[PDB]
Design a protein around this ligand. Structure first.
Ligand SMILES: Cc1cc2c(cc1S(=O)(=O)N1CCN(C)CC1)S(=O)(=O)N[C@@H](C1CCCC1)N2
Ligand SMILES: Cc1cc2c(cc1S(=O)(=O)N1CCN(C)CC1)S(=O)(=O)N[C@@H](C1CCCC1)N2
Ligand SMILES: N[C@@H](CCC(=O)O)C(=O)O
Ligand SMILES: N[C@@H](CCC(=O)O)C(=O)O
Lengths: 262, 262
């Protein structure tokens, strides 16, 4: 029927979507800025739809409760019809691909290690072979699921430690994990996606850094409810933006163009 | 109806698909070895189908003739029903996505520069600002289309030069481009995907090397005819293989495990 305003679900995660300094002075979409904000505008223009940016209610990416089988986060908002599309650093995973549609990836990444500068850790193997330095991941995300499901010796060992570590090594938001790294004097290391790791390394106080190679390789995709008529155009738009070098341009804009660590 | 033997189209491109040294002593699939050969076996197992590997008749990846609008290469074999699926280093592109289906990428890459060791070239900009060193790309592939369609100053300049360069700077196969780099005493540079560039750098006589950063970022996907019932299972299989670390394991097996340059 008649075209409707597309409800976009996203998440406050720097530098993808951030509240503008003067957000209280603004309305609707103008309140936000970031890589995914710019991306949303581009996708909307190439697909010919108008939209409304909304921040996921529970502030989560998306995981299924082992008992209720209920999905939370952005994935849940799509599954239960609360949102028409998710434009955020949402990792393409098998369990998610089965319940929602994903465009081809618009950004690539891999799980990585964030340490406070000077921390005597160079790899995941280093972390797994010691206990003085605690380490964890984000909750309700793909990184935690990666360790939970891995049969790779080193990652299995890490998961075995993290799952029963006390106090908890898991955090509710990336900002929390970063804060813990910064305020733990090198006694806490954070496992997060290289993309977020790289961004933080260029932010003051410039006291963190990515160490070692990525643990895996994957990407973020724009998600729509399974079977959504929007999926097709969105996917083609992602490819066009990729081929025009627009995606690369947006990453440089939000990651390095204005890096604060030289 | 009854399950049929799936006809797989692929291409002789090292180290994706190569004729085994003793291929004349073998039959069918046993004749070949390589990253895509192993990948084909994995995909087939997880999707539950048996298959027959076939080498694309014209030895091309796939491009549409501007006049006849006829597709050649592996893309054409899928479009015209000669093959049921393509398992090869086939780049996911917009023009192709429109006529065939692509699974999520199983390997990432970007266009890069291959030089004979010692060549005074460090970047695409370097190449574009000189003429003593010729440079070109593969025919009927995504790299050539990249330069033909780019509006980015440096790449536009490069394309303008390549399209009218004499003698021709374009080659029919990757092996030809590499041979030209090796036998041109540094007077020819080859633009090819980082994946193939990296493989060659680890092959004797160890006289080539990748220089500069990738010009773009994309990936290879397994392709099926548009609407094919195989697409779904194949995509899920790619994700599972990605998550199990199998894809990373296969790349190491064919790229570095037995590198010949230390
Ligand atoms: C710019 C870009 C385009 C792109 C991807 C990543 C990226 S990136 O921003 O993550 N790029 C990665 C490499 N890095 C050196 C620069 C940034 S991707 O591999 O996740 N998806 C691909 C599209 C194009 C065909 C495959 C899907 N494009
Ligand atoms: C192992 C692997 C998995 C994978 C990709 C590339 C690769 S890779 O072999 O190209 N990998 C790239 C990074 N390099 C350091 C190691 C090899 S990808 O980005 O092209 N596609 C992704 C899947 C997983 C979700 C997105 C599609 N997985
Ligand atoms: N991008 C991840 C969240 C970050 C993480 O898990 O490290 C996801 O989609 O779940
Ligand atoms: N992978 C490319 C071929 C190699 C190249 O163009 O450099 C394609 O699918 O066309």
């Amino acid at each position: 029927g008649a075209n409707k305003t597309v409800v976009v679900t996203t998440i406050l995660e720097s530098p993808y979507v951030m509240m503008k300094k003067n957000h209280e002075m603004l309305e609707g979409n103008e309140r936000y800025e970031g890589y995914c904000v710019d991306l949303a505008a581009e996708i909307a223009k190439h697909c010919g739809f108008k939209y409304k940016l909304t921040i996921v209610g529970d502030g989560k990416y998306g995981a299924r409760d082992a008992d209720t089988k209920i999905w939370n986060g952005m994935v849940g908002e799509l599954v239960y019809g609360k949102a028409d599309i998710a434009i955020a650093p949402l990792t393409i995973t098998l369990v998610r691909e089965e319940v929602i549609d994903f465009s081809k990836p618009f950004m690539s990444l891999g799980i990585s290690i964030m340490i406070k500068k000077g921390t005597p850790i160079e790899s995941a193997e280093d972390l797994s072979k010691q206990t003085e330095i605690a380490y964890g991941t984000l909750d309700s995300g793909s990184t935690k699921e990666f360790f939970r499901r891995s049969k790779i010796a080193v990652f299995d060992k890490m998961w075995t430690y993290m799952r029963s570590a006390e106090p908890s090594v898991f955090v509710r938001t990336t900002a929390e994990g970063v804060a813990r790294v910064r305020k733990s004097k090198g006694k806490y290391a954070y496992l997060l996606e290289s993309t977020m790791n790289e961004y933080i390394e260029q932010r003051k106080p410039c006291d963190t850094m990515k160490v070692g190679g990525n643990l895996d390789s994957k990407g973020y995709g724009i998600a729509t409810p399974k079977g959504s008529s929007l999926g097709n155009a969105v996917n083609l738009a992602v490819l066009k933006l990729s081929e025009q070098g627009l995606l690369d341009k947006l990453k440089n804009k939000w990651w390095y163009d204005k890096g604060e660590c030289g």
